[PDB]
Write an enzyme that holds these catalytic residues in place. Structure first.
Site, PDB file in Angstrom:
ATOM      1  N   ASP A 121       0.816  -1.206   0.000  1.00 48.57           N
ATOM      2  CA  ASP A 121       0.000   0.000   0.000  1.00 48.57           C
ATOM      3  C   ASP A 121       0.860   1.271   0.000  1.00 48.57           C
ATOM      4  N   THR A 159      -6.888   3.252  -2.311  1.00 47.85           N
ATOM      5  CA  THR A 159      -6.528   1.882  -1.993  1.00 47.85           C
ATOM      6  C   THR A 159      -7.531   0.878  -2.487  1.00 47.85           C
ATOM      7  N   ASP A 261       2.169   3.125   3.045  1.00 46.64           N
ATOM      8  CA  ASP A 261       1.058   4.083   3.051  1.00 46.64           C
ATOM      9  C   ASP A 261       0.783   4.697   4.452  1.00 46.64           C
ATOM     10  N   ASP A 308      -0.456  -0.378  -4.988  1.00 43.75           N
ATOM     11  CA  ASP A 308      -1.776   0.066  -5.398  1.00 43.75           C
ATOM     12  C   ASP A 308      -1.781   1.529  -5.907  1.00 43.75           C
ATOM     13  N   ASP A 687     -20.622   5.388 -21.399  1.00 49.96           N
ATOM     14  CA  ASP A 687     -20.180   4.052 -20.960  1.00 49.96           C
ATOM     15  C   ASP A 687     -18.805   3.640 -21.535  1.00 49.96           C
ATOM     16  N   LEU A 689     -18.215   3.214 -24.581  1.00 48.26           N
ATOM     17  CA  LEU A 689     -18.436   2.320 -25.721  1.00 48.26           C
ATOM     18  C   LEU A 689     -19.227   3.010 -26.834  1.00 48.26           C
ATOM     19  N   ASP A 691     -21.827   4.326 -29.300  1.00 49.83           N
ATOM     20  CA  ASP A 691     -23.324   4.391 -29.250  1.00 49.83           C
ATOM     21  C   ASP A 691     -23.883   3.793 -30.517  1.00 49.83           C
TER      22      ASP A 691
HETATM   23  C1  LIG Z   1     -14.754  -3.034 -19.052  1.00 51.57           C
HETATM   24  O1  LIG Z   1     -15.035  -4.479 -19.011  1.00 51.57           O
HETATM   25  C2  LIG Z   1     -16.362  -4.845 -18.629  1.00 51.57           C
HETATM   26  C3  LIG Z   1     -16.508  -6.366 -18.548  1.00 51.57           C
HETATM   27  O2  LIG Z   1     -16.452  -6.921 -19.872  1.00 51.57           O
HETATM   28  C4  LIG Z   1     -17.389  -4.210 -19.597  1.00 51.57           C
HETATM   29  O3  LIG Z   1     -18.583  -4.233 -18.799  1.00 51.57           O
HETATM   30  C5  LIG Z   1     -19.603  -5.057 -19.396  1.00 51.57           C
HETATM   31  O4  LIG Z   1     -20.269  -4.313 -20.408  1.00 51.57           O
HETATM   32  C6  LIG Z   1     -21.406  -4.932 -21.069  1.00 51.57           C
HETATM   33  C7  LIG Z   1     -22.153  -3.873 -21.933  1.00 51.57           C
HETATM   34  O5  LIG Z   1     -22.355  -2.632 -21.206  1.00 51.57           O
HETATM   35  C8  LIG Z   1     -22.380  -5.499 -20.002  1.00 51.57           C
HETATM   36  O6  LIG Z   1     -23.300  -6.388 -20.641  1.00 51.57           O
HETATM   37  C9  LIG Z   1     -24.642  -6.175 -20.124  1.00 51.57           C
HETATM   38  O7  LIG Z   1     -24.904  -7.142 -19.083  1.00 51.57           O
HETATM   39  C10 LIG Z   1     -26.231  -7.137 -18.512  1.00 51.57           C
HETATM   40  C11 LIG Z   1     -26.263  -8.234 -17.450  1.00 51.57           C
HETATM   41  O8  LIG Z   1     -25.411  -7.715 -16.425  1.00 51.57           O
HETATM   42  C12 LIG Z   1     -25.255  -8.547 -15.246  1.00 51.57           C
HETATM   43  O9  LIG Z   1     -24.459  -9.761 -15.415  1.00 51.57           O
HETATM   44  C13 LIG Z   1     -23.010  -9.622 -15.593  1.00 51.57           C
HETATM   45  C14 LIG Z   1     -22.268 -10.966 -15.868  1.00 51.57           C
HETATM   46  O10 LIG Z   1     -22.123 -11.884 -14.754  1.00 51.57           O
HETATM   47  C15 LIG Z   1     -22.438  -8.769 -14.431  1.00 51.57           C
HETATM   48  O11 LIG Z   1     -21.030  -8.578 -14.543  1.00 51.57           O
HETATM   49  C16 LIG Z   1     -23.170  -7.404 -14.301  1.00 51.57           C
HETATM   50  O12 LIG Z   1     -22.546  -6.671 -13.226  1.00 51.57           O
HETATM   51  C17 LIG Z   1     -22.817  -5.235 -13.164  1.00 51.57           C
HETATM   52  O13 LIG Z   1     -23.964  -4.882 -12.352  1.00 51.57           O
HETATM   53  C18 LIG Z   1     -23.835  -5.236 -10.941  1.00 51.57           C
HETATM   54  C19 LIG Z   1     -25.129  -4.885 -10.204  1.00 51.57           C
HETATM   55  O14 LIG Z   1     -26.174  -5.594 -10.874  1.00 51.57           O
HETATM   56  C20 LIG Z   1     -22.583  -4.607 -10.273  1.00 51.57           C
HETATM   57  O15 LIG Z   1     -22.340  -5.196  -8.982  1.00 51.57           O
HETATM   58  C21 LIG Z   1     -21.299  -4.689 -11.149  1.00 51.57           C
HETATM   59  O16 LIG Z   1     -20.235  -3.809 -10.654  1.00 51.57           O
HETATM   60  C22 LIG Z   1     -21.605  -4.408 -12.643  1.00 51.57           C
HETATM   61  O17 LIG Z   1     -21.939  -3.002 -12.695  1.00 51.57           O
HETATM   62  C23 LIG Z   1     -21.404  -2.388 -13.881  1.00 51.57           C
HETATM   63  O18 LIG Z   1     -22.095  -2.766 -15.112  1.00 51.57           O
HETATM   64  C24 LIG Z   1     -23.483  -2.329 -15.246  1.00 51.57           C
HETATM   65  C25 LIG Z   1     -24.109  -2.793 -16.588  1.00 51.57           C
HETATM   66  O19 LIG Z   1     -24.270  -4.231 -16.627  1.00 51.57           O
HETATM   67  C26 LIG Z   1     -23.535  -0.798 -15.049  1.00 51.57           C
HETATM   68  O20 LIG Z   1     -24.875  -0.330 -15.058  1.00 51.57           O
HETATM   69  C27 LIG Z   1     -22.867  -0.379 -13.725  1.00 51.57           C
HETATM   70  O21 LIG Z   1     -22.835   1.036 -13.581  1.00 51.57           O
HETATM   71  C28 LIG Z   1     -21.430  -0.882 -13.618  1.00 51.57           C
HETATM   72  O22 LIG Z   1     -20.628  -0.217 -14.592  1.00 51.57           O
HETATM   73  C29 LIG Z   1     -24.699  -7.628 -14.127  1.00 51.57           C
HETATM   74  O23 LIG Z   1     -24.955  -8.210 -12.835  1.00 51.57           O
HETATM   75  C30 LIG Z   1     -27.300  -7.325 -19.609  1.00 51.57           C
HETATM   76  O24 LIG Z   1     -28.585  -7.218 -18.991  1.00 51.57           O
HETATM   77  C31 LIG Z   1     -27.137  -6.338 -20.799  1.00 51.57           C
HETATM   78  O25 LIG Z   1     -27.997  -6.737 -21.894  1.00 51.57           O
HETATM   79  C32 LIG Z   1     -28.885  -5.720 -22.457  1.00 51.57           C
HETATM   80  O26 LIG Z   1     -28.402  -5.077 -23.671  1.00 51.57           O
HETATM   81  C33 LIG Z   1     -28.434  -5.868 -24.901  1.00 51.57           C
HETATM   82  C34 LIG Z   1     -28.076  -5.008 -26.109  1.00 51.57           C
HETATM   83  O27 LIG Z   1     -27.519  -5.881 -27.102  1.00 51.57           O
HETATM   84  C35 LIG Z   1     -29.756  -6.634 -25.179  1.00 51.57           C
HETATM   85  O28 LIG Z   1     -29.587  -7.646 -26.190  1.00 51.57           O
HETATM   86  C36 LIG Z   1     -30.281  -7.316 -23.914  1.00 51.57           C
HETATM   87  O29 LIG Z   1     -31.600  -7.835 -24.160  1.00 51.57           O
HETATM   88  C37 LIG Z   1     -30.285  -6.344 -22.720  1.00 51.57           C
HETATM   89  O30 LIG Z   1     -31.296  -5.345 -22.976  1.00 51.57           O
HETATM   90  C38 LIG Z   1     -32.326  -5.407 -21.951  1.00 51.57           C
HETATM   91  O31 LIG Z   1     -31.960  -4.728 -20.722  1.00 51.57           O
HETATM   92  C39 LIG Z   1     -31.731  -3.306 -20.886  1.00 51.57           C
HETATM   93  C40 LIG Z   1     -31.041  -2.692 -19.656  1.00 51.57           C
HETATM   94  O32 LIG Z   1     -31.735  -3.051 -18.453  1.00 51.57           O
HETATM   95  C41 LIG Z   1     -33.065  -2.659 -21.325  1.00 51.57           C
HETATM   96  O33 LIG Z   1     -32.933  -1.246 -21.529  1.00 51.57           O
HETATM   97  C42 LIG Z   1     -33.581  -3.329 -22.624  1.00 51.57           C
HETATM   98  O34 LIG Z   1     -34.776  -2.678 -23.116  1.00 51.57           O
HETATM   99  C43 LIG Z   1     -33.673  -4.876 -22.490  1.00 51.57           C
HETATM  100  O35 LIG Z   1     -34.730  -5.348 -21.624  1.00 51.57           O
HETATM  101  C44 LIG Z   1     -25.657  -6.259 -21.275  1.00 51.57           C
HETATM  102  O36 LIG Z   1     -25.263  -7.402 -22.046  1.00 51.57           O
HETATM  103  C45 LIG Z   1     -21.688  -6.223 -18.827  1.00 51.57           C
HETATM  104  O37 LIG Z   1     -22.610  -6.494 -17.747  1.00 51.57           O
HETATM  105  C46 LIG Z   1     -20.572  -5.383 -18.253  1.00 51.57           C
HETATM  106  N1  LIG Z   1     -19.857  -6.145 -17.224  1.00 51.57           N
HETATM  107  C47 LIG Z   1     -19.339  -5.593 -16.129  1.00 51.57           C
HETATM  108  C48 LIG Z   1     -18.619  -6.572 -15.210  1.00 51.57           C
HETATM  109  O38 LIG Z   1     -19.430  -4.389 -15.855  1.00 51.57           O
HETATM  110  C49 LIG Z   1     -17.028  -2.717 -19.823  1.00 51.57           C
HETATM  111  O39 LIG Z   1     -17.903  -2.259 -20.881  1.00 51.57           O
HETATM  112  C50 LIG Z   1     -15.571  -2.485 -20.217  1.00 51.57           C
HETATM  113  N2  LIG Z   1     -15.342  -1.050 -20.310  1.00 51.57           N
HETATM  114  C51 LIG Z   1     -14.822  -0.495 -21.417  1.00 51.57           C
HETATM  115  C52 LIG Z   1     -14.725   1.026 -21.415  1.00 51.57           C
HETATM  116  O40 LIG Z   1     -14.483  -1.191 -22.387  1.00 51.57           O
HETATM  117 CA   LIG Z   2      -3.564   2.300  -0.795  1.00 51.12          CA
HETATM  118 CA   LIG Z   3     -21.935   4.586 -25.347  1.00 49.94          CA
HETATM  119 ZN   LIG Z   4      -3.457   5.920   1.944  1.00 50.80          ZN
END
Ligand SMILES: *[C@@H]1O[C@H](CO)[C@@H](O[C@@H]2O[C@H](CO)[C@@H](O[C@@H]3O[C@H](CO[C@H]4O[C@H](CO)[C@@H](O)[C@H](O[C@H]5O[C@H](CO)[C@@H](O)[C@H](O)[C@@H]5O[C@H]5O[C@H](CO)[C@@H](O)[C@H](O)[C@@H]5O)[C@@H]4O)[C@@H](O)[C@H](O[C@H]4O[C@H](CO)[C@@H](O)[C@H](O)[C@@H]4O[C@H]4O[C@H](CO)[C@@H](O)[C@H](O)[C@@H]4O)[C@@H]3O)[C@H](O)[C@H]2NC(C)=O)[C@H](O)[C@H]1NC(C)=O
Ligand SMILES: [Ca+2]
Ligand SMILES: [Ca+2]
Ligand SMILES: [Zn+2]
Ligand SMILES: COCC(=O)N1CCC(c2ccc3c(c2)C(=O)N(CC(=O)N(C)Cc2ccc(C#N)c(Cl)c2)CC3)CC1
Ligand SMILES: [Cl-]
Ligand SMILES: [K+]
Ligand code: NA
Length: 805
Positions: A121, A159, A261, A308, A687, A689, A691
């Site tokens: 740390d 951290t 740290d 970290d 996001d 990514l 649009d």
């Molecule tokens: C960095 O790397 C990461 C990892 O690869 C990239 O993040 C991924 O991006 C994907 C696209 O944005 C995303 O895929 C979506 O997943 C949805 C299911 O999500 C759950 O399951 C996964 C897998 O186990 C899990 O990891 C998710 O975890 C998130 O949410 C929990 C709380 O629930 C948090 O604890 C966790 O930290 C994480 O939060 C983060 O991600 C969410 C978004 O998922 C953000 O909102 C948070 O702020 C935070 O950043 C989930 O538990 C799935 O439902 C999505 O599918 C929709 O879209 C497609 C379009 O093609 C469609 O076909 C589907 O039908 C569906 O649409 C429907 O739902 C819509 C939304 O509710 C609705 O509007 C529609 O009308 C439809 O009904 C989608 O596939 C993936 O989950 C995340 N993974 C992670 C780990 O974040 C990230 O993009 C990379 N970054 C860069 C800059 O490259």
């Molecule tokens: Ca630290």
């Molecule tokens: Ca976007």
């Molecule tokens: Zn510190």
């Protein structure tokens, strides 16, 4: 409730945590008030300290002792780490010469080399040089293994966000640990280093390494440690787990140190009091390595020594107060310190205005040591927006400073002389990476890289398939002797059209005008050749970008540039051009000031129109290939094609015009030519990514012309600058940016001055990796080079930071 009346006998530091109201004996039981009554007695032995002495050698085993010097201790796996040194005439690991580890040299029954992650740390990058005289074990790991001169943490450089990024390969906006404290508006709860709230799994997203390992049948030590367990006991516990039977023994282990740290906060990063904590961490590394060498595992285990974040000089008197800017200071909540996050004190308050808060904080004092942002306007390289736990209003604080709400917050908590949390480009926040072991390279320096990359490598080190993450797998293959990972280029999804001349001038009704009717067999074949792609090898140096999603687009060739023109977004996705060191800048001729020309290769129905721009009183336009850099007065007409036009706010055109007229030529002069690829980005839901069309929230008034949220450029040249960009035989050099497309220059406090005083500073703030542009565009660059794909992946992750040395 816990019925703590069971026993830890034969369970000390058990790997599988048992469920309440059964009492626990694992390394976290203390933190939960849940240990069995006899945990201290049985598991936290301390008698006779941590070292063998000559008189203890061959002693009769006394089970009360912290560690053992009895003859049976190697069999039992519980010798003091210096046992063989004191009692068997062996040398400390640090005193041995270093010898290349060409293959793993493991005891029978080891299926793979274990990985031990030793996390420190607050270990700032420059400690490696500046503390070198007091850290001989760490310095041996560093010189004998693979090291980087520094490793870039994620923002915020705190951290918990960084340790959990190391474990997941995810940005904090994706894993959810977005600060050391955070409020979740959906949970109506706050996460802090203190208390029980952090225990709830609801905060912790993604799939950390220990879970990735367990799901794939690789056993994992615990990565969290109760703070009261002393370091010597954590090391002994790891060495004991390493002596378990094959079917029970973990393959991955973590040790965490709260130092340097803890002292850094009190004394500053280079306080004289900092020497001792560095010596103490080095001694702990010494214990581990001696312990491994006793177990004949010192040429078998891969060790990662990683920090970290770093530490900066920060004092109470360098605090900016919000009460000095705002009047309604009681209507806000601030997450204070080395970053600021502001939200309403009450959600039942409809008269809370983010706009007016931002304006009251913008360029208000000439020396102001913070800058307010709406989170979507923060530099894209920070990746710090797409989470409900990140407040809409963000303050980026200058290094060495703090922000607080009111003075009463600072004196009713000078305590501290160090802190961290600043922008992850800041030199003082950079941290360390060393990898030592059979799978790492021998005596190898690697370039600086980002900590988001390490999860993929740790997975490679363990034979695991990584969960989806933000690393670019293959970009750190150059760290490894073996186990690489064989990356391959993504397949192109959309193939381009190559339109010829298909439309007569009079088919267009775009409301555009150009003064271009001035009339040769020598130079009419010539122009034809240019439109067919004769100069394409000059302006497209690394292949055309691949389009990785389904769409309709055309390749358009010109004497001076090539573009991929989207029929859906009515503008190029990318425009590519090369500017040699010798190239001349010219003006836009007076008669051509408002010139826009129909492009006879592209239909009226898939073109922009000048009328929309005339009617939209807020929106103007610019060009992706700059008319200033035309190769001839004749080629300049191609720059005014409607297919080279993009929508630009007048405020943004100030930035863009300066980049195009002054900066491109400066870089070409400095770098011996540059290749430029420029284009729009649409990220309305912030996001990171690309649009889809149905996510666009703003169009040029009364048209289907979508407004970009950002404009990018990727500027490539030869790393050997003695060779011109267009004739480069070896590695490449790149810098890139993602400029926010804003209707004002409120971000640049000096913007009333000449562009030469502020534009380049803005561009530098918005420096980016090629990979960030790829996520934001769905394009894949550098498809055709003479370089290895691993090397190109490293190039795509490079960030030009513009910090001093
Ligand atoms: C960095 O790397 C990461 C990892 O690869 C990239 O993040 C991924 O991006 C994907 C696209 O944005 C995303 O895929 C979506 O997943 C949805 C299911 O999500 C759950 O399951 C996964 C897998 O186990 C899990 O990891 C998710 O975890 C998130 O949410 C929990 C709380 O629930 C948090 O604890 C966790 O930290 C994480 O939060 C983060 O991600 C969410 C978004 O998922 C953000 O909102 C948070 O702020 C935070 O950043 C989930 O538990 C799935 O439902 C999505 O599918 C929709 O879209 C497609 C379009 O093609 C469609 O076909 C589907 O039908 C569906 O649409 C429907 O739902 C819509 C939304 O509710 C609705 O509007 C529609 O009308 C439809 O009904 C989608 O596939 C993936 O989950 C995340 N993974 C992670 C780990 O974040 C990230 O993009 C990379 N970054 C860069 C800059 O490259
Ligand atoms: Ca630290
Ligand atoms: Ca976007
Ligand atoms: Zn510190
Ligand atoms: C999905 O996983 C969540 C989980 O299994 N949890 C169960 C454990 C629980 C817990 C329980 C008890 C504690 C702590 C957390 C806790 O944070 N500390 C402080 C602490 O270890 N360090 C400051 C160092 C540290 C080491 C590694 C990492 C990482 N990666 C990180 Cl982020 C920090 C010690 C007390 C949190 C939730
Ligand atoms: Cl924080
Ligand atoms: K206009
Ligand atoms: Na301004």
């Amino acid at each position: 409730w816990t019925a703590t009346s069971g026993s830890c006998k034969g369970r000390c530091f058990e790997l599988q945590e048992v469920g309440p109201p059964d009492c626990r004996c694992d390394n976290l039981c203390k933190s939960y008030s849940s240990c069995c009554h006899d945990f201290d007695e049985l598991c936290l032995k301390t008698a006779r300290g941590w070292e063998c002495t000559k008189d203890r050698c061959g002693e009769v085993r006394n089970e009360e002792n912290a560690c053992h010097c009895s003859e049976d201790c190697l069999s039992r796996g519980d010798c003091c780490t210096n046992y063989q040194v004191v009692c068997k005439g062996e040398s400390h690991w640090v005193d041995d010469d270093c010898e290349e580890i060409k293959v793993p040299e493991c005891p029978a029954g080891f299926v793979r080399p274990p990985l031990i992650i030793f996390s420190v740390d607050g270990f700032r990058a420059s400690y490696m040089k500046k503390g070198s005289k007091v850290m001989p074990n760490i310095e041996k790991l560093r010189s004998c293994g693979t090291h980087a001169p520094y490793m870039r943490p994620v923002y915020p450089t705190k951290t918990f966000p960084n340790l959990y990024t190391l474990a997941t390969g995810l940005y904090p906006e994706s894993h959810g640990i977005v600060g050391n404290s955070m409020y979740d508006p959906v949970f109506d709860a706050s996460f802090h280093l203190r208390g029980r709230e952090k225990f709830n799994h609801r905060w912790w997203g993604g799939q950390p390494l220990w879970i990735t390992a367990t799901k794939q049948g690789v056993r994992a030590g615990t990565f969290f440690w109760s703070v009261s367990i002393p370091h010597e006991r954590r090391i002994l516990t790891i060495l004991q787990w390493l002596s378990l039977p094959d079917n029970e023994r973990p393959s991955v282990y973590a040790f965490y140190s709260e130092q340097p740290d803890f002292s850094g906060h009190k004394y500053g990063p280079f306080g004289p009091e900092m020497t001792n904590p560095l010596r103490e961490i080095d001694k702990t590394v010494g214990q581990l390595m001696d312990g491994l060498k006793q177990l004949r595992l010192h040429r078998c285990v891969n060790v990662i020594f990683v920090g970290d974040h770093g530490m900066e000089d920060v004092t109470c008197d360098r605090t900016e107060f919000l009460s000095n800017y705002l009047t309604n200071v009681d209507d806000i909540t601030l997450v204070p310190g080395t970053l600021g996050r502001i939200r309403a004190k009450s959600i039942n308050n409809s008269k809370y205005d983010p706009k007016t808060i931002i304006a009251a904080l913008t360029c208000k004092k000439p020396d102001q040591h913070f800058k307010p942002y709406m989170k979507q306007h923060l530099p894209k390289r920070l990746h710090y927006a797409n989470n409900r736990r990140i407040e809409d209003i963000h303050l980026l604080v200058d290094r060495r400073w703090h922000v607080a709400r009111k003075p009463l917050d600072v004196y009713k908590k000078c305590f501290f002389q160090g802190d961290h949390g600043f922008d992850n480009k800041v030199n003082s926040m950079q941290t360390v990476f060393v990898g030592y072991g059979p799978t790492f390279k021998y005596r190898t320096k690697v370039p600086p890289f980002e900590n988001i990359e390490l999860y993929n490598v740790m997975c490679d080190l363990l034979g695991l398939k990584p969960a989806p993450n933000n690393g670019t797998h293959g970009s750190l293959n150059h760290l490894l002797r073996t186990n690489t990972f064989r990356p391959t280029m993504p397949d192109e999804v959309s193939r381009p059209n190559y339109p010829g001349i298909m439309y007569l001038q009079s088919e267009f009704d775009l409301g555009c005008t150009c003064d271009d009717k001035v009339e040769n067999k020598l130079e009419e074949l010539n122009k034809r050749l240019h439109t067919k792609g004769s100069t394409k090898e000059r302006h497209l140096l690394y292949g055309r970008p691949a389009v990785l999603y389904r769409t309709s687009y055309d390749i358009l060739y010109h004497t001076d540039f090539e573009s991929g023109y989207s029929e859906i977004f009515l503008m190029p996705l990318w425009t590519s051009y090369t500017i040699s060191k010798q190239a001349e800048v010219s003006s836009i001729p007076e008669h051509l000031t408002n010139c826009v020309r129909p492009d006879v290769r592209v239909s009226p129905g898939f073109s922009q129109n000048c009328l929309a721009y005339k009617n939209d009183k807020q929106m103007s336009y610019g060009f992706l290939f700059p008319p200033y850099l035309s190769s001839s007065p004749e080629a300049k007409y191609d720059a005014f094609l409607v297919t080279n036009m993009v929508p630009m706010y007048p405020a943004f055109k100030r930035v863009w015009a300066y980049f195009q007229r002054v900066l491109v030529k400066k870089y070409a002069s400095e770098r011996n030519g540059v290749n430029v690829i420029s284009g729009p980005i649409f990220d309305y839901n912030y996001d990171g990514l690309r649009d889809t069309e149905d996510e666009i929230k703003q169009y040029v008034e009364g048209s289907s012309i979508p407004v970009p949220t950002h404009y990018y450029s990727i500027i490539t040249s030869c790393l050997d600058f003695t060779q011109p960009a267009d004739k480069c035989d070896g590695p490449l050099s790149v810098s890139s940016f993602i400029l926010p497309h804003r209707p004002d220059n409120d971000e640049s406090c000096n913007s009333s001055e000449d562009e030469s005083k502020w534009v380049e500073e803005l561009m530098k703030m918005h420096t980016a990796r090629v990979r960030d542009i790829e996520h934001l565009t769905g394009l894949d660059f550098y498809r055709k080079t003479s370089r290895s794909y691993s090397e190109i992946l490293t190039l795509k992750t490079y960030l030009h930071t513009y910090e001093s040395e």
